[PDB]
């Protein structure tokens, strides 16, 4: 069977970031305003000291992997202003002047979709303006230069010629561009339209981080009201109704109590940062390969064959566009692996035999184009007598006619 | 999270008040002077701002660029074509291994005393 | 370095070091001093090796990651954008370091450029002609197809080319003229 016609579809994917770097102070959280709390807990050392050197390793990651993600590249492009994209159109995707952020209109739709105790929360490095800004030149880069402006200097190219490279990677000859070039962008431009409708309906992924990451320090402000075991939860009271000489075993019990909780804490963080590492490896390692190339990998670059890829940024993560070629329609036919001519065994140098029956033709293998058999088609490499299925027939020649 | 009128009230001799004082969405930055231009970014502060030791030789603070910025030259029509080349050597680092540390817990713990040990097969399983 | 200094932690201990408390005072009274440091001591131990444990998964990811990169650049060129290194990719030449392995990619990189004019296709005797693999560009007055990456023009022949179908289709088209090499030669 060989397929007669196609869909390009459009597949969105989702990818978490970064988590929220976060900080606490291990005095103002154990005590309150107690020196003898401090006091008692400069009896076991070191502790709130490491609690500190575990949690700025896990805030500057949280740098490193947006660094990463994002600039892959150094030079800021401007878009054109001529929208001349021979029939596509991108508004969608590309930022507009007039927002007070400069986010695109499919950016804007998702940014909506998104919802003390020494406990403090340090801001980013980036800013969701710098990120935005870079997303805008990866959008242009690949416009205008295709892949070039990720291998060197960005090289100028047609949008409407660079689409027959990318065809032509999957095998599919150009001429099947050329000539449909109207139809293959009001089906690209139809399927943007879905997904804004998708995402007007699913951040799960993203989501629940900015769930998890609120719901632990929740349990670790309440984690203070527990009496642990202790005759109450107030220093004061500890400190007033009871002398100090037997209030120590109190608190010594309380502090040791209130403790393990942020012991525990801190690694149900590394715990989870270790996962977003791997995530963060994964999208750069997408955004490498499926937005500033093109990747054979199979199901790499979401279902079917792959064109190209657009960014889209979002909060502490990133949404890809994967543009994808898929055959359907396709017809029953007979086939042989090799055609006898003259005593010898041709083969076809590309393409495939088929017959409705009633005539001989080669084709090439994804999209039924027929075409007449000629020595110019095939190479010849044998007797027929030792290939199986060989079917005999006759092999035209160009330059029979050229015998004047 | 302190706002810069506050600042001065914990307070490290000179930087008490009466100096250059910057506020900024990471917090109050004092010592150093705020300028228009942008660069990239020698050392991080957040929020967008960097800070640098420049040449008079003083420390500033400033909105970090994004790097250069160029157009590119598109046309329905038109095409670049390189006519050179050159080949380039880059060196990648990859960490393989760490030291095979080992641990002693008897030692560590109780030195050379026997009653130590009596003490540590209460809690069973640890050292094992 | 801190779990050595862990050592000197008194937990509340009457002494850091339990040889004092273990000569000074009698059993019933060491039994129940002792206890507090053996809990000390533990709680400062199991720290120490859930983080050996987190560094150890991570470096694993990083000797997995080196032993894919070196099948794929070393005993083979791979086409992986940006995988083996920055550029159009070579070949590699692996380096040891202590405890590590260092990596010379070598990579080729397209430098100068010039502009040119460009046509999907040529319109001839009424039938398009496309190129096999180059793409056609003018200096402005003539028309040739070139190789991608590097300039290296020629001229038109019928067999850089290959024909589809009439001119009446495609969007843009240049009339002009496809040679024949066999042309005098078939006289
Ligand atoms: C292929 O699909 C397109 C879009 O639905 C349609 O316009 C065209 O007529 C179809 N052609 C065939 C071969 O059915
Ligand atoms: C195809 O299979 C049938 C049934 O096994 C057999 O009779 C026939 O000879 C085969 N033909 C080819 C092409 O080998
Ligand atoms: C092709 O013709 C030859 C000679 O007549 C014959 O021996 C052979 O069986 C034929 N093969 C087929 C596939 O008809
Ligand atoms: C700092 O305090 C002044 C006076 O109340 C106020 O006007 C200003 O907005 C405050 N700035 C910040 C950063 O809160
Ligand atoms: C480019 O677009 C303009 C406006 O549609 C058109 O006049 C011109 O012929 C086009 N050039 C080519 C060669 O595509
Ligand atoms: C290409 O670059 C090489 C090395 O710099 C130089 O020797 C040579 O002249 C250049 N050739 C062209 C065509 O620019
Ligand atoms: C284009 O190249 C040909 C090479 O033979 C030359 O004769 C012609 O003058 C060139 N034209 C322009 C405008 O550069
Ligand atoms: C090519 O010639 C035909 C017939 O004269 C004409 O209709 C068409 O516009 C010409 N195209 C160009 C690009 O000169």
């Given at each position: 069977?060989?397929?007669?016609?196609?869909?390009?579809?459009?597949?969105?994917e989702?990818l978490?970031?970064?988590?929220?770097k976060?900080?606490v102070?291990?005095?103002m959280?154990?005590?309150?305003?107690?020196?003898?709390?401090?006091?008692?807990?400069?009896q076991?050392?070191?502790?709130?000291?490491?609690?500190?050197?575990a949690?700025?390793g896990?805030?500057?990651?949280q740098?490193?992997?947006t660094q990463?993600?994002?600039?892959?590249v150094?030079?800021?492009?401007?878009?054109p202003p001529?929208?001349?994209?021979?029939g596509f159109?991108?508004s969608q995707?590309?930022?507009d002047?007039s927002k007070?952020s400069?986010?695109s209109?499919?950016?804007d739709?998702?940014?909506?979709?998104?919802?003390?105790?020494?406990?403090?929360?340090?801001?980013?490095?980036?800013?969701?303006?710098?990120?935005?800004?870079y997303?805008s030149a990866?959008l242009?880069?690949?416009?205008?230069?295709?892949?070039?402006?990720?291998?060197?200097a960005?090289?100028?190219?047609?949008?409407?010629?660079?689409?027959?490279?990318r065809?032509?990677?999957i095998?599919?000859?150009?001429?099947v561009?050329?000539?449909?070039?109207?139809?293959?962008?009001?089906?690209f431009?139809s399927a943007?339209?879905?997904?804004?409708?998708?995402?007007?309906?699913?951040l799960?992924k993203?989501?629940?981080?900015?769930?998890?990451?609120?719901?632990?320090?929740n349990?670790?402000?309440?984690?203070?009201?527990?009496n642990?075991?202790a005759?109450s939860?107030?220093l004061?009271?500890?400190l007033?109704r009871?002398?100090?000489?037997?209030?120590?075993?109190?608190?010594?019990?309380l502090?040791?109590?209130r403790l393990?909780?942020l012991?525990t804490?801190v690694?149900?963080?590394?715990?989870?940062?270790a996962?977003?590492?791997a995530?963060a490896?994964?999208?750069?390692?997408?955004?490498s390969?499926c937005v500033?190339?093109q990747?054979?990998?199979?199901?790499?670059?979401?279902?079917?064959?792959?064109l190209?890829?657009?960014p889209?940024?979002a909060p502490?993560?990133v949404?890809?566009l994967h543009?994808t070629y898929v055959?359907?329609?396709?017809?029953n036919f007979?086939?042989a692996?090799?055609?006898?001519?003259?005593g010898k065994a041709?083969?076809?140098?590309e393409?495939?035999?088929?017959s409705?029956?009633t005539h001989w033709?080669?084709?090439?293998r994804?999209?039924?184009?027929?075409?007449?058999?000629t020595?110019?088609?095939?190479?010849?490499?044998?007797?027929?007598?030792?290939?199986?299925?060989?079917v005999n027939?006759?092999?035209?020649?160009?330059?029979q006619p050229?015998?004047? | 999270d302190?706002?810069?009128?506050?600042?001065?009230?914990?307070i490290?001799?000179v930087?008490?008040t009466?100096s250059?004082?910057?506020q900024?969405?990471?917090?109050?930055l004092?010592?150093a002077?705020?300028?228009?231009?942008?660069?990239?970014?020698?050392?991080?502060?957040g929020?967008?701002?960097?800070?640098?030791?420049?040449?008079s030789?003083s420390?500033?603070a400033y909105?970090m660029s994004?790097?250069?910025?160029?157009?590119?030259?598109?046309?329905?029509?038109?095409?670049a074509?390189?006519?050179?080349?050159?080949?380039?050597?880059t060196?990648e680092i990859?960490?393989?291994?760490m030291?095979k540390?080992?641990?002693?817990?008897?030692?560590?713990?109780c030195?050379?005393?026997?009653?130590?040990?009596?003490?540590?097969?209460?809690?069973?399983?640890?050292?094992?």
């Open positions: 069977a060989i397929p007669t016609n196609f869909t390009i579809s459009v597949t969105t989702i978490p970031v970064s988590m929220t976060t900080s102070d291990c005095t959280y154990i005590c309150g305003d107690s020196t003898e709390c401090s006091n008692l807990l400069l076991y050392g070191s502790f709130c000291t490491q609690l500190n050197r949690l700025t896990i805030a500057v990651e740098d490193k992997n990463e993600v994002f600039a892959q150094k030079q800021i492009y401007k878009t001529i929208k001349d994209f021979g159109n991108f995707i590309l930022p002047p007070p400069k986010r209109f499919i950016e739709l998702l940014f909506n979709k998104v919802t003390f105790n020494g406990l403090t929360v340090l801001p980013p490095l980036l800013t969701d303006e710098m990120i935005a800004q997303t990866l242009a880069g690949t416009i205008t230069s295709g892949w070039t402006f990720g291998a060197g960005a090289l100028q190219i047609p949008f409407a010629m660079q689409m027959a490279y065809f032509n990677g095998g599919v000859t150009q001429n561009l050329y000539e449909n070039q109207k139809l293959i962008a009001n089906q431009n943007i339209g879905k997904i804004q409708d998708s995402l007007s309906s699913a799960g993203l989501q629940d981080v900015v769930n998890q990451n609120a719901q632990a320090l349990t670790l402000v309440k984690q203070l009201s527990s642990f075991g005759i939860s107030v004061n009271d500890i007033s009871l002398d100090p000489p037997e209030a120590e075993v109190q608190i010594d019990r502090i040791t109590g393990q909780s012991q804490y690694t149900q963080q590394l715990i989870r940062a996962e977003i590492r995530s490896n994964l999208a750069a390692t997408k955004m390969e500033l190339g990747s054979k990998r199979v199901d790499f670059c979401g279902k079917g064959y792959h190209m890829s657009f889209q940024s502490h993560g949404v890809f543009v055959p359907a329609q396709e017809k007979t086939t692996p090799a055609i006898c001519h003259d041709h083969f076809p140098r393409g495939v035999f088929v409705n029956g033709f080669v084709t090439q994804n999209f039924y184009e027929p075409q007449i058999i020595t110019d088609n095939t190479f010849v490499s044998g007797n027929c007598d030792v290939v199986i299925g060989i027939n006759t092999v035209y020649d160009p330059l050229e015998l004047d | 302190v706002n810069c009128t506050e600042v001065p009230v914990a490290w001799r930087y008490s009466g250059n004082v910057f900024t969405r990471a917090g109050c004092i010592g002077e705020h300028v228009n231009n942008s660069y990239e970014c020698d050392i991080p502060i929020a967008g701002i960097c800070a640098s030791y420049q040449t030789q420390i500033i909105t994004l790097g250069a910025e160029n157009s590119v030259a598109y046309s329905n029509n038109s095409i074509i390189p006519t050179n080349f050159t080949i380039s050597v060196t990859l960490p393989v291994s030291t540390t080992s641990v002693d817990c008897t030692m560590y713990i030195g050379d005393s026997t009653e130590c040990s009596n003490l540590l097969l209460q809690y069973g399983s640890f050292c094992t």
